[model samples]
Target: GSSGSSGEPRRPRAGPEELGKILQGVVVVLSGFQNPFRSELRDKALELGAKYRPDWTRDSTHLICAFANTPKYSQVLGLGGRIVRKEWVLDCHRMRRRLPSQRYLMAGPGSSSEEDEASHSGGSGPSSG
Candidate 1:
């Protein structure tokens, strides 16, 4: 069996009212990005079910970029979007010093042994049933 099970899906990082307001429609957009770490970021976003968009628009909820001085940066801010540092977003869940057992996926997985299975199976394991 495939190792990963996409559960109900992770909620958008910055919104809560959507839980009741727009249950059927939700998205997080990433833009203005050129980075050596993008491959890693893209993979991480996939794990979280985030989609990538080419251009900024009113629908964009997250604008990940480096430096606060670019025109794109300014536009995102002016439009009231949230900006997260490119470095922070990519490394916060990875490059930090933490237990080999602690990856972002297990931040709160109710199944205590699931992560061990992840590690044991190298993140791809047979189904329990």
Candidate 2:
């Protein structure tokens, strides 16, 4: 169901255009096996038309896996894309039931690095103030 899938915007005010655009052209690399939960990750990739590569590469996008701390986790990050564990997705979809507490970990305008810098700036107010 598209109800709360990646295509859905975190904010009700976000138009459809801003929802999935973040994942556009993002090459996904799945790490987990064909388990029941893995199906959901594959399904989400299908929704985004994302390609699943066997190994990591510059072209690779996010590394969807069952566990982020796995030995293979580094391999995925070595390729580079937001390392989104399957559990996060499950928790996201509420253990394959409902939307997670948040739409995305840190969704906002600009590239991933830009968003991180902005969010991690500590405070938007002046330090003197």
Candidate 3:
């Protein structure tokens, strides 16, 4: 009951035991998700003791991303922060525990730099006429 009461019907509440262990020290910023889903991710992360940043900052340690190559993704990656897909949160919620983070890693099996290179790559343009 120390988790206390909430006014929002769909909202979840919990204490330290809530999120298991993997996300305990993680600080997060969300990229590309809107409204209801954003709120859902925010609520889950909050219940799990993870902090959220409205904007990406040097201090931000993690990014819960919907897609790779977001503007914030570039910033966080450049700063050397962890980037995981939104499904990581969903799976954690489903299991009621932290799964191995690598299992849910996003941007690809490779890191953001790799994904960035892939996304930024383009074929020849305007071949000399």
Candidate 4:
């Protein structure tokens, strides 16, 4: 039997000029995920004019983090880095404009943990013998 679907069509790649300079001069560091999703995020950020780094550095303007507990998350948090979720990059790419990072900001370790704790077993106490 032959397959019902045909091969997928390719999309036109965006050039630097066409992509706009929304993220111009922004240095992006990724954390808390693996490729090809990781590469996808990096590519999108780069397409928007952001420079990608393997690790967090003093010059890194933003950290594209997946969650609040990654090693980079802690380091960046300590260094007072701008920690944002991947949606920030993706949204900027899709919107073709620089949106405020505040909308996609990742919660700090303390804040996330506190929120999690508050949501779990609020009335249940630990049992001991």
TM-score of each: 0.44, 0.45, 0.64, 0.68
What lDDT score is found at residue 64 in candidate 4?
A: 88
Clashing pairs for predicted structure model 2, backbone only: 92-100
Clashing pairs in 1: 3-125
Sorted by lDDT (best first), the order is: 4, 3, 2, 1
- CA lDDT, candidate 2, residue 67: 53
Q: Answer with 2 or 3, whichever has the higher TM-score.
A: 3
lDDT of 3 at 27: 70
Error of 1 at 73 (Å): 0.6
Per-residue lDDT for 19-70 in model 3, tens only? 6354655677888989898887787775555667788866565678888767
Looking at model 4, residue 82 earns an lDDT score of 75
Higher TM-score: candidate 2 or 4?
A: 4
Report the lDDT of model 2 for residue 30.
69
lDDT of 4 by residue, 1-129 (tens): 333333444457754445446666678898877899987787788777777778887778688888776777878887777788999988888887779777677754432321112211111111111
C-alpha root-mean-square deviation, candidate 2: 14.2
Question: How many residue pairs collide in each prediction?
Answer: 1, 1, 0, 0
RMSD of each: 15.4, 14.2, 15.8, 18.6
Q: Which ten-residue region of model 1 has the weakest summed lDDT?
A: 118-127
Could you give the candidate ranking by TM-score, starting with the highest? 4, 3, 2, 1
Candidate-wise lDDT, in order: 0.43, 0.46, 0.63, 0.69
Per-residue error (Å), model 3, residue 21: 5.2
